[PDB]
Structure formats: structure tokens, C-alpha cells
Amino acid sequence: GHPLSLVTRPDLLPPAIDVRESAPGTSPGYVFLAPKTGDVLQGPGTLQSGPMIVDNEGEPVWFLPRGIGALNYVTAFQRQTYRGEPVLTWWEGAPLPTGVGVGYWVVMDQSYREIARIRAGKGHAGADLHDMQITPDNTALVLIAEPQLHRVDGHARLVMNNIVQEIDIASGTVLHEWDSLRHVDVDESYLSSIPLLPYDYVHINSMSVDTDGNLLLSGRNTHAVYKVDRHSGDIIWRLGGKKNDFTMEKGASFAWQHDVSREGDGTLSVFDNAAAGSIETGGGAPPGTVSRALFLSVDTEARTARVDRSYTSPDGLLSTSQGSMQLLPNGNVLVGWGSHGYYTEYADSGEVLMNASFKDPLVNSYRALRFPWHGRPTDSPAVAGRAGAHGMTVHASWNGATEVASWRILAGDTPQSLSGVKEVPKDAFETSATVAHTSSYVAVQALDSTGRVLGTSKASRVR
Numbered sequence: 498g499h500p501l502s503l504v505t506r507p508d509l510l511p512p513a514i515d516v517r518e519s520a521p522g523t524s525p526g527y528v529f530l531a532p533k534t535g536d537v538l539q540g541p542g543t544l545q546s547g548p549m550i551v552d553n554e555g556e557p558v559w560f561l562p563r564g565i566g567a568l569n570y571v572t573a574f575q576r577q578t579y580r581g582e583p584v585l586t587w588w589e590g591a592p593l594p595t596g597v598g599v600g601y602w603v604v605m606d607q608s609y610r611e612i613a614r615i616r617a618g619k620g621h622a623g624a625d626l627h628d629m630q631i632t633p634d635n636t637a638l639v640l641i642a643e644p645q646l647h648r649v650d651g652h653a654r655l656v657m658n659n660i661v662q663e664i665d666i667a668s669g670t671v672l673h674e675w676d677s678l679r680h681v682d683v684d685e686s687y688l689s690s691i692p693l694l695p696y697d698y699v700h701i702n703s704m705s706v707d708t709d710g711n712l713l714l715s716g717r718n719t720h721a722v723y724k725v726d727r728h729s730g731d732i733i734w735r736l737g738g739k740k741n742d743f744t745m746e747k748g749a750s751f752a753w754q755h756d757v758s759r760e761g762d763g764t765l766s767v768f769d770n771a772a773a774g775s776i777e778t779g780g781g782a783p784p785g786t787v788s789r790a791l792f793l794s795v796d797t798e799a800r801t802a803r804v805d806r807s808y809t810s811p812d813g814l815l816s817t818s819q820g821s822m823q824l825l826p827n828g829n830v831l832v833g834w835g836s837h838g839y840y841t842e843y844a845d846s847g848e849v850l851m852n853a854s855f856k857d858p859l860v861n862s863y864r865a866l867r868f869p870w871h872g873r874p875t876d877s878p879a880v881a882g883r884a885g886a887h888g889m890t891v892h893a894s895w896n897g898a899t900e901v902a903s904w905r906i907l908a909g910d911t912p913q914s915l916s917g918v919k920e921v922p923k924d925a926f927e928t929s930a931t932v933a934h935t936s937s938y939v940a941v942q943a944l945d946s947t948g949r950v951l952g953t954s955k956a957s958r959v960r
């Protein structure tokens with residue numbers, strides 16, 4: 498059971514989260530999630546989906562119920578930077594039965610207003626859902642996944658081509674385009690053939706910029722990371738896979754991986770699912786295999802790779818798809834367990850600091866990522882007053898507000914004769930408070946930690 502019931506916001510039913518552990522040293526800031534449920538037919542009836550920012554207790558801070566099952570599927574929510582400003586980004590669109598999506602990426606500023614929409618170049622239906630990254634030059638790496646007739650074993654075969662476009666965000670112009678079928682051979686795939694589906698031979702699911710400005714592309718179904726020349730498109734090297742360029746130390750190989758990036762300590766992070774579904778692979782996976790969040794010491798001059806350090810779930814999870822990892826500024830590591838609706842923050846030493854899961858066991862998030870966030874909502878707090886036997890309860894919330902520390906409660910016989918009766922700390926998304934004297938109207942003011950008024954609700958008739 499996940500639905501959170503809110504007196505002030507009957508329209509918001511955010512999924513509940515169970516935080517089973519929260520030692521001190523957990524990082525500040527917020528966890529960014531896009532809760533979803535896979536069922537096309539029943540999804541909308543069991544879950545309100547959309548981007549969600551929660552605190553270290555699992556309480557929502559902002560929730561935008563934008564997702565509609567598989568009608569408007571929302572995923573891959575995070576914070577990025579555009580023109581030096583913090584922005585929110587996610588994908589919304591149509592998930593297709595072939596395993597890819599057709600949609601676009603929303604860009605929203607700190608006041609929760611849409612400032613741009615990042616689309617695949619014209620001549621394509623839209624962009625796939627597995628990643629989009631805003632580069633230091635304010636261009637977007639976008640992925641297009643489309644079926645294409647290709648010669649596979651002398652006999653033509655429908656294959657899922659992956660095209661990576663670099664898009665100037667302000668203008669929408671395509672600056673660069675990289676076509677996987679022109680560079681990566683279909684026989685590099687580990688994927689078992691699934692009858693009557695396009696052969697999803699590479700399945701790019703992460704695109705990022707390395708320190709030299711070239712691209713790093715994670716190919717799930719080739720088990721490989723491609724470094725690609727930013728300008729020529731030539732493959733610079735292959736890490737992993739059937740044409741591996743690197744000498745791998747014991748334990749450094751990954752499989753069916755996600756979320757690859759260059760990290761500030763010089764390592765390359767790889768979420769190593771270590772397994773996929775039974776059909777897409779040969780059959781089941783070896784008993785006892787688990788997923789790991791992996792930091793690789795990759796020496797590209799010597800073409801060697803070894804494990805610097807890794808982190809596994811305290812719950813023994815094997816995630817057959819999705820997932821994420823993030824190195825945080827204090828040295829902590831946050832891991833989202835993908836197909837499993839869990840996320841875990843560790844100290845560098847590997848000690849579990851925070852472990853959480855969706856209360857509903859069918860809900861998960863593609864990624865779970867932590868960022869500072871300062872919301873600047875442009876609406877007002879919502880309020881509600883409920884008369885009781887010997888008093889009344891006042892409820893207050895302000896979706897998107899991050900700086901509310903306290904609530905001042907106002908009450909009076911008329912909207913124009915409200916007076917301050919009480920101040921209480923904020924202790925939830927929606928905070929409740931009881932007051933002895935029941936009045937006819939109420940309002941609330943949100944106060945920051947210095948006591949300054951951030952916003953005021955409308956007057957609300959008690960009920």
C-alpha cells in the first residue's frame with residue numbers, strides 16, 4: 498500500500514517509501530525518483546506516477562503526477578545544469594513493446610516551469626527513454642532507437658538501430674549524429690534471439706562526456722562501453738564485450754550493465770546488473786549472482802581495467818534491468834536497484850547508511866539520484882481546517898517548497914480577521930496541528946529557518 502492521503506491536496510497520491518535504515522552521515526540534499534509500475538492495463542489504477550523529490554525519510558518534497566501508466570510514461574528524472582542553472586529533466590512519451598520509447602525530454606527550472614523541450618531531430622518519431630545528458634556546452638546527447646532491416650547471417654533481419662544525436666538545446670539543431678549499425682557489428686551482441694521482435698542488439702542506455710570531451714556509450718546487450726570521437730564518430734575503444742580492447746583483472750568484467758560515467762576520483766562507474774531476463778540471455782543466471790555498483794580503475798593508455806571498489810545490496814538483489822550509481826561529494830555512494838524498487842546509500846568504506854524501498858512491491862524507479870535542490874514555487878501553500886470534538890486540526894503543505902522550516906497558523910471569524918494562533922515545525926510533506934479554539938476560517942504562512950515568511954495560503958473555511 499503506497500497511497501499517501503493528503504487533506505490539503507486530494508489530487509496528490511504519491512507512492513509511500515519505507516526507509517529501513519538511516520545512520521548519520523547520509524548526505525544532505527534530496528533523492529530524485531520517477532516511480533512507475535510496469536503493468537500497461539492496470540498501471541493507472543494502482544499508481545500515480547511522475548517525477549518525485551523526497552527527503553532522507555522518504556517524505557515527498559515535490560511530486561508532479563504527470564505520468565499516466567503507459568499513456569504518458571515518465572522516467573529518468575534527475576537534476577542537470579543548463580546555462581549554469583540547476584534544472585529538472587525527465588522523459589515522457591510512449592513505451593513501445595519492442596523495449597524502447599518514443600518521446601521527448603522536459604526541462605524545468607527551479608520555479609517548476611518548463612523552459613525547454615529536447616526532441617530528437619526531425620525525420621525521427623522521437624527520442625528513446627534510456628538517457629539524455631546536458632553537456633557542458635548546453636547541447637543534449639539524445640538516443641533514437643528504431644527498427645531497421647539489416648543483413649544478419651546472410652539473411653536480412655530486423656534490428657533495433659541506436660542513433661546518438663547531439664542537439665543544440667536552444668535551437669533544436671542536430672550538430673552530430675552517430676549510427677550504431679555503422680560502427681558496432683550485430684554479432685557483437687550477447688542477446689538471444691526473441692522471435693518476432695526487432696533484434697535489440699546493442700541497446701545503448703547511458704551517454705556521457707569523458708574528461709577529454711569524447712563520448713562514453715553504455716551498450717547493455719553487447720556488455721560493452723564504447724568511447725566515441727566527439728567529432729568523427731569513430732570508436733576510440735571498446736571496454737568489455739566480444740571485442741574487448743582492455744586486459745581485465747579478475748572480477749572487473751561486467752554484463753548487461755547500466756549508468757556509466759567518468760567520476761571525479763578518476764574511476765569509471767558502472768552499474769553492473771550482472772544479469773538480464775531469462776529469455777534475453779540463454780536461460781536463468783548462476784545461483785547466487787547479485788548486482789553491484791562498480792568503480793573501475795581504467796588505464797586507457799595501458800588498456801587495463803581492475804576493480805577499485807564495489808558495493809552490493811544488503812538485501813541480496815539481482816536487478817535484471819535498470820539501475821544507477823552515483824559518487825557523492827562527501828565520498829558516499831548512492832545506488833538505485835533498478836527493477837527492484839530499492840535504493841541504498843553507503844559510506845565509502847561500504848557501510849550501509851540508508852536503505853529504502855517503495856512500500857508497494859510493484860513500484861520501482863529507473864534511477865535513484867541525490868542532488869541539492871532549492872525550489873522557488875510560484876503558487877501558495879495549501880491549507881485545510883477540520884473541526885473536531887473539542888477543537889480543530891489545521892493541515893498545511895506547499896508542493897515544491899524546500900526551505901519551509903515552520904508553519905504559522907492563522908485563524909479568525911472572517912478571511913479579513915485572521916490572527917496568528919500558533920507556530921509549529923514542519924515535520925512532513927503535509928503537517929498537521931491542533932488548536933484548542935475552533936474558528937470559522939484559517940490560513941497558514943510558511944516560514945524559513947530564520948523566521949521569514951516565504952508564502953501565505955488563501956483563507957479557507959473550516960470544515
Ligand SMILES: [Mg+2]
Nearest residue numbers: 733734735742
Ligand atoms: Mg581499436
Ligand SMILES: [Mg+2]
Nearest residue numbers: 756758822823
Ligand atoms: Mg551514475
